[PDB]
């Protein structure tokens, strides 16, 4: 899903009563990985010691 | 049915609001009975006009 922005109309305080504020909630989902690690070549420079 | 008025307050930013449930009451009115009685003799009822 793409960027979705939700607007919370009422936030609550410690005693579960309104404290006079609002909110803006946003999220999205995604995932990725490599299928064939033989189609690339990475160059690594070991600067160890 | 009788009631009071809601009690507001002055509050800062991001302050949980107090509880202000109003209180109700109930007036009562009973109904009573009054009576009068006038007895007349049969002779008088026949004779007087």
Cross-chain Cβ contact B16/A14 below 8 Å: yes
Residue with token string 């404290």: A19
Cross-chain Cβ contact A20/B19 below 8 Å: no
What the block records as the tokens of A26 is: 């946003």
Residue A5 near residue A24 (C-beta atoms within 8 A): yes
Q: Among residues B13, B20, B19, which one has the least CA distance to residue A11?
A: B13
Give CA–CA dist A20/B8, Å, rounded.
Answer: 14
Structure determined via:
cryo-EM
Specify whether the backbone of B11 is left (phi greater than 0), alpha (psi in -120 to 50) or beta: beta
Of the candidates A15, A17, A21, which has its C-beta nearest B14's C-beta? A21
Query: Scanning the structure block, which residue is given the tokens 């209180």?
Result: B23
Resolution (A): 3.5
């Amino acid at each position: 899903i793409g960027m979705t922005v939700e607007f919370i109309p009422h936030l609550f305080g410690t005693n579960r009563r309104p404290n006079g504020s609002r909110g803006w909630f946003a999220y999205y989902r995604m995932g990725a990985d490599v299928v064939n690690p033989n189609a690339f070549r990475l160059l690594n420079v070991e600067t160890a010691s | 049915v009788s009631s009071a008025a809601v009690q507001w307050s002055w509050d800062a930013e991001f302050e949980e609001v107090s509880d202000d449930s109003p209180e109700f009451g109930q007036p009562e009115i009973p109904v009573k009975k009054a009576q009068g009685f006038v007895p007349i003799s049969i002779e008088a009822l026949q004779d007087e006009a």
